[PDB]
Amino acid sequence: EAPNQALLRILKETEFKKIKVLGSGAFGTVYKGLWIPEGEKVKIPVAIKESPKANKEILDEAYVMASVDNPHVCRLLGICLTSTVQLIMQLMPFGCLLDYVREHKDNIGSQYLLNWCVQIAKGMNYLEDRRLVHRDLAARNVLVKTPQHVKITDFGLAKLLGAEYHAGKVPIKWMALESILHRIYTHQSDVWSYGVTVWELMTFGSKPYDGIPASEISSILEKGERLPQPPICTIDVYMIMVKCWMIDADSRPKFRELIIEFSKMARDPQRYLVIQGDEMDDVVDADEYL
Numbered sequence: 001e002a003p004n005q006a007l008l009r010i011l012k013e014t015e016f017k018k019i020k021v022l023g024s025g026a027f028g029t030v031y032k033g034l035w036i037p038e039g040e041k042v043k044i045p046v047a048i049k050e051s052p053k054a055n056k057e058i059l060d061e062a063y064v065m066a067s068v069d070n071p072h073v074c075r076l077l078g079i080c081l082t083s084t085v086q087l088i089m090q091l092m093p094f095g096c097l098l099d100y101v102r103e104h105k106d107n108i109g110s111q112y113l114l115n116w117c118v119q120i121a122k123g124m125n126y127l128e129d130r131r132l133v134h135r136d137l138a139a140r141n142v143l144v145k146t147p148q149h150v151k152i153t154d155f156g157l158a159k160l161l162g163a164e165y166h167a168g169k170v171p172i173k174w175m176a177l178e179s180i181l182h183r184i185y186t187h188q189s190d191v192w193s194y195g196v197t198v199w200e201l202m203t204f205g206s207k208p209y210d211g212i213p214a215s216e217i218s219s220i221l222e223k224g225e226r227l228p229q230p231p232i233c234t235i236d237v238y239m240i241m242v243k244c245w246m247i248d249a250d251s252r253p254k255f256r257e258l259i260i261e262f263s264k265m266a267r268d269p270q271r272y273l274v275i276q277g278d279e280m281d282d283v284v285d286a287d288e289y290l
């Protein structure tokens, strides 16, 4: 009911230089680019994401992105209204945490793993405060700014609630039972996804329910079957994931409490995660351009 005073910044085609192509898929095309804000005398490294139905959707993704401000959520720097709609957002130099955990398995420590968990839990709790259900929380949708700093992305599904959301193609494997069965989406349904996300990291990017068709997941979870205990996980950690995968959504841990546990755990990570051998000129990062 609070009026959304977020400002939407329109950018000049000329204001920024499109460098390389970070990636092209179903979601669209992402480009590595530089943004020079006119008289500003700053260079901002950015990522530029590029039909009326297509244009409608991208703008709603912009509406959500502009309305958020958190050290653990991807920021919209502005939009460019050309022949095509482009979202200009802070460049995350290390891409998605999924590829990162996959590509750096042998050098990823328990301290990092446990902190990533805090950082996600934090962001998710911010989106909770902002009455916004993510609906698509995965390790692929969590970007790496620095290995010491991760931020939540992909607000294409994000739904801003007011005073259980009722709903296209969907993940299934990160989805909660009620979401699969009844398209009921809540912050606690995001807790399920967070649990799954943790499982992805503790397995160093293992595919959830590998070799199981999505049409089977429904009955599987109804039967009481869940994702197994990742080898690096002490029972203390696996229990947290197991609490996210409860049938009663009120029995799922609150994001504010997951922040607590994971922080307690990151105060001594080796007790909780058992990993083998655990022991150009005027450039400014967006996080410093306010």
Ligand SMILES: */C(=C\C(=O)N1CCCC[C@@H](n2c(NC(=O)c3ccnc(C)c3)nc3cccc(C)c32)C1)CN(C)C
Binding pocket: 022, 023, 024, 030, 046, 047, 049, 074, 089, 090, 091, 092, 093, 094, 095, 096, 097, 098, 099, 140, 141, 143, 153, 154
């Ligand atoms: C995860 C895919 C993956 O790692 N990316 C997600 C989408 C494509 C871009 C890619 N990428 C970026 N992205 C951003 O900087 C960015 C910033 C803000 N919002 C968005 C949506 C994107 N930056 C990158 C730097 C280096 C390499 C790459 C690839 C990169 C990240 C796994 N997939 C399932 C394969």
